């Protein structure tokens, strides 16, 4: 009786939200951006190839100086690369080799990683002893660690396969905030440029926008037909793009609270592993299972170019903070640095 | 055209690669086993005989180092992280023979043995395990023999039309799992009958892994 009545009210609320979104859908992003000229063909060459990982690479993250990056592989090694020279700055042996994510702190003093061990380990890069040591192991998730992002040297947000995201206090080792509401494994998260909000994509084919300070879900974005594997904020923080197993990328707007554009091609039938934006946001770079990375025109939904330089699944990619280069990591155990030429 | 500190940084990088190569060679001389199975299938008993989210067990047997990974605690979606184990030497799948007349506690309608077969079919025929051998353990041999005297195998498999004895019912169950092998050319299934007091399980794994090591050597050398 009471349960039946309540679940009927949820359907009414869902219809109310759907009608509200349809009311403000006066135009389409495609119609708005019809007049603008296309970006043309985007040609990027492999400037650097980072060799040394001996297993599949699952994650990489640029440092804020746009020169150092950290990559994680399931050979149990965290490696910090000097992308300009391809020199290895550090090689961090991981206690658990089943790492799925890695993050570089914006200060450059810390890196984080974690995988099937359900632990987010924080590593101190600046020690008087001259070696990288574990400073914290963040326990509390009951599923595998899928993504992590630093807010500062003391705060980090992690997403897990236990359907929850958590905000951690690194100094005390306790999760100050727990973000619940996903019904599937959360696979990725992206921080807003001001680090006051973050979006997460889960295996329930939905993307939720979370308030870091308040700790509740502000908006929920649906439209994908399969698990969301990747998510990335637009450079202004007012939009984000997702990548799913249905071979599509979608651009959602926070303020319009609905999907604006879909990035798919008929030839593409494989899942998407990673997504990122260029510095201006005009380019959306997505990594795919078909061993390639496709550069999309974000505004016009045109495939601007292809990065085809890997012999296995492109598992991760990232664009530098200055926008100078994009790195792609792959299951073939190599990282490559790409940029165009005049 | 390198400065005095740039040359030292390149020398430091070569020191890192000299250790990454050293660690990679040592990692290639070790055996990695993905331990799978269902609840109350004797999986924990196998670990006790071979002494967070994932549990890794190290043991050395006859100058060979084994790393056995247990993922029984990972209650999340398997398809999201099952690809992390693509490349393990072998998969140890444990099936409880006595769990043929029993039923699932939650489902209350699916046979316990039929539950294992579906899991075995989805793992053996998984796209990440096309050429990965499987070491099949059939635990609770003694308990199955006691139950087969009172409870016939016809309850679990209606099509069974053989003698209601251990020597035939157990062999019939073995053929049922081996029949689920959808690729009988790229991989082989090593079936063993363990027990609660058996001590040859580790020897069987060493022999089964040794054949898997030989097969991989033949492929790399070009003979296979």
């Amino acid at each position, epitope marked *: 009786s009471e349960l039946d009545q309540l679940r009927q009210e949820a359907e009414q609320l869902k219809n109310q939200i759907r009608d509200a979104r349809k009311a403000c859908a006066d135009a389409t992003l495609s119609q708005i951006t019809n007049n603008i000229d296309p970006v043309g063909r985007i040609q990027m060459r492999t400037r650097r190839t980072l060799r040394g990982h001996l297993a599949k690479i699952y994650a990489m993250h640029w440092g804020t100086d746009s*020169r*150092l990056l950290v990559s994680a592989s399931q050979d149990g090694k965290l490696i910090i690369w*000097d992308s300009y*020279t391809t*020199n290895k*700055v*550090h090689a961090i042996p991981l206690r658990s080799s089943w790492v799925m994510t890695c993050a570089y702190a914006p200060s*450059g003093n810390y890196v984080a990683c974690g995988g099937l061990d359900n632990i987010c380990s924080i590593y101190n890069l*600046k020690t*008087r*002893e*001259g*070696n990288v040591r574990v400073s914290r192991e963040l326990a509390g998730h009951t599923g595998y660690l899928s993504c992590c992002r630093f807010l500062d040297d003391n705060q980090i947000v992690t997403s897990s396969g236990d359907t929850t995201c958590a905000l951690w206090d690194i100094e005390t080792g306790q999760q100050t905030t727990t973000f619940t509401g996903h019904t599937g494994d959360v696979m990725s998260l992206s921080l807003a440029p001001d680090t006051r909000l973050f979006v997460s994509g889960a295996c329930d084919a939905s993307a939720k926008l979370w308030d870091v300070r308040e700790g509740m879900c502000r908006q929920t974005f649906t439209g994908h037909e399969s698990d969301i594997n990747a998510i990335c904020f637009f450079p202004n923080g007012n939009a984000f793009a997702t990548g799913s197993d249905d071979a599509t990328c979608r651009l959602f707007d926070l303020r319009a609270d609905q999907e604006l554009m879909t990035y798919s091609h008929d030839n593409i039938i494989c899942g998407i592993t990673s997504v990122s934006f260029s510095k201006s946001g005009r380019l959306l770079l997505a990594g795919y299972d078909d061993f390639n990375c496709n550069v999309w025109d974000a505004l016009k939904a045109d495939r601007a170019g292809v990065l085809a330089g890997h012999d296995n699944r492109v598992s991760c990619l990232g664009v530098t903070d200055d926008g100078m280069a994009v790195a792609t990591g792959s299951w073939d155990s190599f990282l490559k640095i790409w940029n165009g030429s005049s | *055209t390198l*400065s*005095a*500190e*740039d*040359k*030292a*940084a390149v*020398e*430091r990088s*070569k*020191m890192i690669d*000299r250790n990454l190569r050293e660690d990679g060679e040592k990692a290639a001389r070790e055996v990695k086993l993905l331990l799978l199975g269902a609840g109350e299938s004797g999986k924990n008993t196998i670990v006790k005989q071979m002494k967070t989210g994932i549990v890794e067990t190290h043991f050395t047997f006859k100058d060979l180092h084994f790393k056995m990974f247990d993922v029984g605690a990972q209650r999340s979606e398997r398809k999201k992280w099952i690809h992390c184990f693509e490349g393990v030497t072998a998969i140890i799948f444990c099936v409880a023979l006595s769990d043929y007349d029993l039923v699932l506690a939650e489902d209350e309608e699916m046979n316990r043995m039929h539950a294992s077969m579906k899991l075995f079919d989805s793992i053996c025929n998984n796209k990440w395990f096309t050429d990965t051998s499987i070491i099949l353990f059939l635990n609770k041999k003694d308990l199955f023999e006691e139950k087969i005297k009172k409870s016939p195998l016809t309850i679990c498999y209606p099509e069974y039309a053989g003698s209601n004895t251990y020597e035939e019912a157990a062999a019939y169950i073995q053929c049922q799992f081996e029949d689920l092998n959808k690729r009988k050319d790229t991989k082989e299934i090593y079936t063993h009958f363990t027990c609660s007091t058996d001590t040859k399980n580790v020897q069987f794994v060493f022999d089964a892994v040794t054949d898997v090591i030989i097969k991989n050597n033949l492929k790399d050398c070009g003979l296979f």
Partner: single-chain antibody
Amino acid sequence: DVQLVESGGGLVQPGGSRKLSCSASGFAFSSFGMHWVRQAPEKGLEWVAYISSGSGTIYYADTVKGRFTISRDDPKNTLFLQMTSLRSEDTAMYYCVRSIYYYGSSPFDFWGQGTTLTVSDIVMTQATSSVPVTPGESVSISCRSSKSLLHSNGNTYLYWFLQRPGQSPQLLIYRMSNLASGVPDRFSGSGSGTAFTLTISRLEAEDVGVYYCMQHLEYPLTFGAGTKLEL
């Protein structure tokens, strides 16, 4: 804590041989390159030898090459300096210096206490030998180099050291602008090309000492004469 203790020094006859040891504790010894730097009595710092991490690269000063041998024992965390044919010119305090080299590292960050031995090229110029100073007042120290220390990679390999009276040198500024860990922010390094300035805002009693500028553009590493601050 990070420690570098030197031993084996003492009075030796000319033409003799002596073995210097540097025991390291509190840091990853095998990860650091090691230098020997000596200081003649009432004189400035002089670089002696260098052995890299992994012992693959070894450099010597021309004045000691062929007579001194530098070696390390990574398992024992000991740095060695085998000296032969010792001359009266070798009478100095020998310092053990650790230095690690990667992008953004701070070489020459820690120095040993030193051991005293008594026997019976880019030019770095610090023309101002002494500067009278008062606490709370801003002081600038100038250094010059015969060659441009700015490399094509954008780094300017100039280092600043402070040797307080009775103490070992301490790193203040590495690569001409970066502030070393544990150094107050009042110290600032500014330079261009061959001319460099070390600015000390709000001078204090601890800042009293001798300041040395060193170049790390190429070997042999050379030191300036040194600028002494006195009250």
